[PDB]
DNA sequence: CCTGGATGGGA
């Protein structure tokens, strides 16, 4: 009858996360479960018999059960994990242990990160010959401190003949552990105190695919958090350090205080696809160096935050990065962008992504991005661009350009010269105060998406955005305002499918009618539709002219009433309506006859005291009803009974003491969701709601533990299964 | 490596 795995939830996974458990649950048969998650409980002691009932486990997560500062120490009996002979993955992270427990040989992945284990020797990982993955980060650093440092004894890991991944970050290491297994494909030793590297440190590691050695010589300028500055001026790299790494696909040297590069570092890495040079002092290097000469397979290059301690121009060697797909140049702080600055990138055949934000650019010739071969995304957000030189997804597929958070006060169509192939643009969070009239975006003949939110557009002109013949989505949200009429242009936008006028300063001379044959989605939330629909018949047909409209969002409009007339005069094509977060107290549910094709209705966050008015009227096509976070106290029988297509209903965060089956009739059997959490259910031993929820248990989210009682006081705040309610 | 610009994940 009951779910078999109380107080946990069965996903062959069983989820016991965040249940304040102090011991491993014992729960018909527990011999078919293979995965158990106990994340962030209170288990502080583990014992030889704790997992005996879970003999066939393959995966075990115990993260955050006994967190070190920030105090907790975990005790583990010797035979604890041995009961699980087929155990493959074990996560022991964020637990105060000082030694690694005894483990079965079937182990494959192991996490020991953020513990108090300070020493790894040959005895620590005994019998783990099939171990492929070992993580142990953050055992000795400012958030999990230790006197001295973690010590990995030379050759301790050589028993792991199958090891591919090894991470030992934030451990205050001063050297790379010696004689590591040569089978390694991933080595991460970043953010220790390794101020010196050479071929000795990486000896015998010929199967390395990525290597992370960043943060070992940190500049700490404007560091928000406790940081250890490198004693020397820079990381010391022996010229032949990585020279024997013939499979190296990834190298990260971030925050290494590098002042110059050296071409010797890369000349052996003929598979190098990823290079992270961010957070060093290469401002002058990147402009002159020849190091990029033979990085032929290089796909990703991170140059971010290499700022000056002239005019920026990338080195000529960049023209050899024929495989380059992505370039990060954020936070470099060069105030001028021109035809030279990036010239050696233009002929690069596959360069699609260019990151150029947080650079304090106040002069930019955007035309240069029209000369590029395969550019798909250029981010110029958070800069100081103020004019011509002297919904965004758009993801992966559309020539997109982001000019968010700049200093545009006026749009002059000459700033878009050569950008005519742009399909998406964002000018949000500028300070554009300008009466749009149709002369601002002429070159943008192919623009499909335009984000102009958080500006100060005057929108009286009916010719607005008419020079954008392919415009499909327009975001004018959070726009702050004696001729024309507000929003008159919508009818003259032939292809507009999505529009947002959310949170706008609406004028008195706002148009009384919105029109379009193409608009399918309108966000009109955060406006004054309550004060507009109280003005009589003036705005009674405000939305009627949007023929074909499918989705309307009328959230946060301070609606206290919703007459049938206003409903009847919405487009008959409507399928989704959201009145979320209004002040609707009473509502005639039979008035949904006026929305014949309505499929989804969201009335969450209103004052619906009850569901009485009122009945879901046949033959509504309503599939989803959301009445969460009202203060519903009751519902009339057969309320949902006539909604033959009803699948989802959310009654959460109300104040029902029960949930009755007579509310639904035969419909409740087909419900896909029935969310009843956060209700003060009265858990008397008679209660029949438990018999109802149990009938549709799979369709009830958080049933096993998330649905709580509100009374009686001893069962309050506790699950409806805390005591067995079916006994009287 | 991914993520952000700091640090934690990871498999
Ligand atoms: C029901 O509404 C609440 C409101 O906060 C939300 O948290 C919850 O996710 C919703 N349930 C479903 C099934 O969407």
Short mmCIF file of N, CA and C (backbone and C1' of nucleotides) in Angstrom, two decimals, chain A residues 63 113 137 141-143 167 278-279 300 302, chain B:
data_model
loop_
_atom_site.label_atom_id
_atom_site.label_comp_id
_atom_site.label_asym_id
_atom_site.label_seq_id
_atom_site.Cartn_x
_atom_site.Cartn_y
_atom_site.Cartn_z
N UNK A 63 27.29 12.87 0.86
CA UNK A 63 27.80 14.24 0.90
C UNK A 63 27.10 15.12 1.94
N UNK A 113 36.70 14.57 -1.33
CA UNK A 113 36.87 16.02 -1.31
C UNK A 113 36.26 16.66 -0.07
N UNK A 137 39.68 17.19 -3.18
CA UNK A 137 39.97 18.61 -3.19
C UNK A 137 39.61 19.27 -1.86
N UNK A 141 42.76 24.38 2.96
CA UNK A 141 42.72 25.74 2.43
C UNK A 141 41.83 26.61 3.31
N UNK A 142 41.69 27.89 2.98
CA UNK A 142 41.10 28.86 3.92
C UNK A 142 39.67 28.57 4.41
N UNK A 143 38.95 27.69 3.71
CA UNK A 143 37.59 27.34 4.11
C UNK A 143 37.52 25.95 4.76
N UNK A 167 42.06 14.55 -8.97
CA UNK A 167 41.99 15.95 -8.60
C UNK A 167 42.44 16.14 -7.16
N UNK A 278 43.82 32.75 -18.69
CA UNK A 278 43.14 33.84 -18.00
C UNK A 278 43.81 34.23 -16.68
N UNK A 279 43.56 35.46 -16.24
CA UNK A 279 44.04 35.96 -14.94
C UNK A 279 45.56 35.99 -14.76
N UNK A 300 39.44 26.36 -28.08
CA UNK A 300 39.09 27.35 -27.08
C UNK A 300 40.31 28.06 -26.52
N UNK A 302 41.11 31.11 -23.61
CA UNK A 302 40.67 32.06 -22.60
C UNK A 302 41.78 33.04 -22.23
"O5'" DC B 1 40.56 22.25 -19.25
"C5'" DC B 1 40.26 21.38 -20.34
"C4'" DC B 1 38.94 20.66 -20.11
"C3'" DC B 1 37.76 21.57 -19.78
"O3'" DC B 1 37.12 21.97 -20.99
"C1'" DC B 1 37.90 19.81 -18.18
P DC B 2 36.39 23.40 -21.09
"O5'" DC B 2 35.18 23.30 -20.07
"C5'" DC B 2 34.05 22.53 -20.43
"C4'" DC B 2 33.06 22.52 -19.29
"C3'" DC B 2 32.63 23.89 -18.79
"O3'" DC B 2 31.58 24.42 -19.61
"C1'" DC B 2 33.17 22.48 -16.95
P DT B 3 31.37 26.01 -19.75
"O5'" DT B 3 31.11 26.52 -18.25
"C5'" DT B 3 29.93 26.15 -17.55
"C4'" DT B 3 30.08 26.49 -16.08
"C3'" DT B 3 30.16 27.98 -15.81
"O3'" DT B 3 28.83 28.45 -15.59
"C1'" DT B 3 31.84 26.80 -14.55
P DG B 4 28.43 29.95 -16.00
"O5'" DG B 4 28.81 30.81 -14.71
"C5'" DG B 4 30.00 31.55 -14.77
"C4'" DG B 4 30.51 31.98 -13.42
"C3'" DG B 4 30.83 33.47 -13.42
"O3'" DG B 4 30.88 34.00 -12.11
"C1'" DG B 4 32.83 32.25 -13.38
P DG B 5 31.10 35.58 -11.91
"O5'" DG B 5 32.69 35.75 -11.84
"C5'" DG B 5 33.40 35.29 -10.71
"C4'" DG B 5 34.85 35.74 -10.73
"C3'" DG B 5 35.08 37.23 -10.97
"O3'" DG B 5 36.19 37.68 -10.19
"C1'" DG B 5 36.15 35.98 -12.67
P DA B 6 35.95 38.22 -8.69
"O5'" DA B 6 35.71 36.88 -7.84
"C5'" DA B 6 36.76 35.95 -7.64
"C4'" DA B 6 36.22 34.79 -6.81
"C3'" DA B 6 37.22 33.68 -6.49
"O3'" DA B 6 37.16 33.42 -5.10
"C1'" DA B 6 35.21 32.77 -7.34
P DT B 7 38.15 32.35 -4.43
"O5'" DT B 7 37.30 31.00 -4.44
"C5'" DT B 7 36.00 31.00 -3.85
"C4'" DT B 7 35.12 29.91 -4.44
"C3'" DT B 7 35.50 28.49 -4.04
"O3'" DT B 7 34.46 27.98 -3.21
"C1'" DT B 7 34.93 28.64 -6.36
P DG B 8 34.65 26.59 -2.43
"O5'" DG B 8 33.87 25.54 -3.34
"C5'" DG B 8 32.46 25.66 -3.46
"C4'" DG B 8 31.95 24.73 -4.53
"C3'" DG B 8 32.26 23.25 -4.30
"O3'" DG B 8 31.06 22.51 -4.49
"C1'" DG B 8 32.94 23.92 -6.46
P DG B 9 31.06 20.90 -4.47
"O5'" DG B 9 31.03 20.50 -6.01
"C5'" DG B 9 29.93 20.96 -6.78
"C4'" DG B 9 29.97 20.45 -8.20
"C3'" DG B 9 30.07 18.93 -8.34
"O3'" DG B 9 29.13 18.51 -9.33
"C1'" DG B 9 31.84 19.97 -9.53
P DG B 10 28.80 16.95 -9.53
"O5'" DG B 10 30.02 16.40 -10.42
"C5'" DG B 10 30.26 16.96 -11.71
"C4'" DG B 10 31.45 16.28 -12.36
"C3'" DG B 10 31.49 14.77 -12.16
"O3'" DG B 10 31.06 14.06 -13.35
"C1'" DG B 10 33.51 15.78 -11.29
P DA B 11 31.84 14.20 -14.76
"O5'" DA B 11 32.36 12.71 -15.05
"C5'" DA B 11 33.73 12.38 -14.88
"C4'" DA B 11 33.90 11.06 -14.13
"C3'" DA B 11 33.04 9.90 -14.62
"O3'" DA B 11 33.81 8.70 -14.64
"C1'" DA B 11 32.60 10.30 -12.33
#
